[PDB]
């Protein structure tokens, strides 16, 4: 019904490398493993739990089609 | 007042105007409002980037946008 | 009841130059056209939309009667 | 909530000079005129509306008997 | 059932010196007078009100039993 | 279903060293001692309380199962 879900779900389903930018000026990288009401797991060497409230932007490494409905 | 978010974001969208979104950390994002909902804005430029409104300070159009109001 | 609405309305009605300080450090300038539960529209050249969650303090440029 | 209203009320009544520090490191000064669920009106030369969500700490300039 | 209340109660009655670190990096000091759902009153020379939303970490100066 | 409960529980169960990056860019280390809807207890040399609203990301120092 909303946007968050399909956007993250395409990125993950596609295992596309993404960048996640934090409010503190840090730039995380890796693939979107899973997500939540509150968190995303970004997979790199380890799984890391990023809190949505500390996220500024989510930026794919390339155009991902069909981020649909 | 009334609800001002939608009529403003919608104006910027149908008119495919270039905007600058400013983050709470004082970083500047550019592009066009592709879509938006209760929590996020999709800013199309070279890709689509999901921006969380909670991380957004101010939205600025690059030129005046008519009505921008219901 | 609330203070935020009588206070802003007086600035809007009397169309006074205000300085909106944001949590980053940036000092916004201009006039308040309208507002909302979540945003203020500050005008100068363009109509720009501020989220209240990023505002620290609203300072009038000159004294305003913001009574009740 | 009920630890806050009595603290600010006491400050306001004594018209005590206070020091408001914001989540960004800036330090505001003046007197508490009014307050709300969301805002404090700190009076200086002008009345300035401060959002609580942007404040970290409110510091009395001298002791104040609260609740 | 939470940890945040037994944790602050323990520090309170024990009057152990704590260090409150703020979201921005500032370090407050003193003893925990009382507390709320939204605020903590940190006493030293004066009673200062700290907003929890601006608090990053609460670090007691000595080990404390904090159970229930 | 919560994802932050299994992840935190696994990390704690295994007593694994983690790094907690705060909304200010400072890194905290230790082991997860317990946790709340609002806080985590990071055990290092002292039992310290970290608020979740000040946490960017939680980083296990080595791969963990989190089945």
Best of F1, F2, F3 to substitute, by most chain A Cβ atoms within 10 angstroms, is F3
Which residues are CB-contacts of D13 (< 8 A; sequence separation ≥ 6)?
none
**Chain B neighbors (3+ CB pairs < 8 Å):** A, C
Instruction: Give CA separation, D6 vs A22, D3, D29, D35, D64, in Å.
Output: 37, 6, 20, 11, 11
User: Where are the domains positioned within chain E?
Assistant: 1-68
Dihedral sign computed on CA atoms, order E5, E6, E10, E11: negative
Across C33-62, b (16+ Cβ under 10 Å) vs e yields bbbbeebbbbeeebbbbbbbbbbbbbbbee
The tokens of B53 are what? 């409104």
Class of domain F1-67: mainly beta
Mode of pairing for the β-strands spanning A27-35 and A39-43: antiparallel
* Chain D hits for E36, Cβ within 8 Å: 1-4
The residues of D whose Cβ lies within 8 A of any Cβ of C are 22-24, 26, 28, 34-39, 41-42, 45-51, 53-54
- Per-residue three-class SS string for chain A: CCCHHHHHHHHHHCCCEEEEEECCCCEEEEEEEEECCCEEEEECCCEEEEEHHHEEEEEECCCCCCCCC
Contact F59 A48 (CB under 8 A): yes
Cβ contact A37:A4 at 8 Å: no
Q: Do chains C and B touch (3 or more CB pairs under 8 A)?
A: yes
Residue E6, CA atoms < 13 Å, CB-side half-sphere:
13
Determination method here? X-ray
The secondary structure of residue C53, as a DSSP letter, is: G
**How many whole angstroms separate alpha carbon B22 and alpha carbon B29?**
6
The tokens of A7 are what? 């956007």
Strands (E), chain E: 18-22, 27-35, 39-43, 47-51, 55-60
* Closest by Cβ to C58, choosing from D34, D38, D48: D48
Specify the fold of B1-70: SH3 type barrels. (2.30.30)
* Chain D hits for C23, Cβ within 8 Å: 22-24, 54
Cβ contact F23:E56 at 8 Å: yes
**How many whole angstroms separate alpha carbon F38 and alpha carbon B59?**
31
The tokens of C46 are what? 């363009």
Contact B55 A23 (CB under 8 A): yes
Residue E61 DSSP SS3: coil
**How many whole angstroms separate alpha carbon B62 and alpha carbon B48?**
19
Residue of F41, D22, A38, F45 whose CA lies nearest to E57:
F41
* Closest by Cβ to E36, choosing from D1, D25, D64: D1
Considering the segment(s) A1-69 as one domain, its CATH architecture is Roll (2.30)
Mode of pairing for the β-strands spanning A17-22 and A27-35: antiparallel
Best of C46, C52, C56, C58 to substitute, by most chain B Cβ atoms within 10 angstroms, is C46
Q: Do chains A and E touch (3 or more CB pairs under 8 A)?
A: no
Closest residue in E to D25 (Cα–Cα): E24
D66: number of Cβ within 10 Å: 17
**How many whole angstroms separate alpha carbon D62 and alpha carbon A64?**
60
**How many whole angstroms separate alpha carbon F46 and alpha carbon A66?**
49
Strands (E), B5-69: 19-23, 28-36, 40-44, 48-52, 56-61
* Closest by Cβ to D50, choosing from C8, C25, C57: C57
What burial class does residue F14 get, using C-beta atoms within 10 Å of its C-beta: 0-12 exposed, 13-18 middle, 19+ buried? middle
Helix or strand (DSSP H, E) at C7: helix C4-13
* Closest by Cβ to C23, choosing from D48, D49, D54: D54
Which residues are CB-contacts of F27 (< 8 A; sequence separation ≥ 6)?
F19, F20, F21
Which of 2.30.30.100, 3.40.50.1820, 3.90.226.10, 3.20.20.10 is the CATH number of E1-68? 2.30.30.100
């Amino acid at each position: 019904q909303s946007l968050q879900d399909p956007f993250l779900n395409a990125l993950r389903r596609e295992r596309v490398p993404v960048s996640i930018y934090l409010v503190n000026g840090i730039k995380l990288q890796g693939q979107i493993e899973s997500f939540d009401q509150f968190v995303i797991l970004l997979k790199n060497t380890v799984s890391q739990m990023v809190y949505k409230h500390a996220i500024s932007t989510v930026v794919p490494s390339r155009p991902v089609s069909h981020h649909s409905n």
